[PDB]
């Protein structure tokens, strides 16, 4: 995938989080990106190895 220039690999899945309007990505304790907001439909997904 390549989401707004951010590249990687994994499995996309529906998510049940509510990003604030000023947020785009979401990290964890390991500091890797776990969720992303689709830049077209504006839905939130979950990235899994």
């Amino acid at each position: 995938f390549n989401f707004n220039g951010l590249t990687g690999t994994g499995v996309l899945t529906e998510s049940n989080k509510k990003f604030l309007p000023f947020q785009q990505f979401g990290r964890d304790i390991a500091d890797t990106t776990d969720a992303v907001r689709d830049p077209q439909t504006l839905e939130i997904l979950d990235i899994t190895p």
Binding site: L20, G26, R27, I29, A35
Partner: peptide, 24 residues
């Protein structure tokens, strides 16, 4: 006059979503 601020004055540092963690 003077007053005491107890724990006021905190804002979001970055624009990244986090949940169920403790950040420094």
């Amino acid at each position: 006059a003077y007053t005491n601020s107890f724990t006021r004055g905190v804002y979001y540092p970055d624009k990244v979503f986090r949940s169920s963690v403790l950040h420094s």
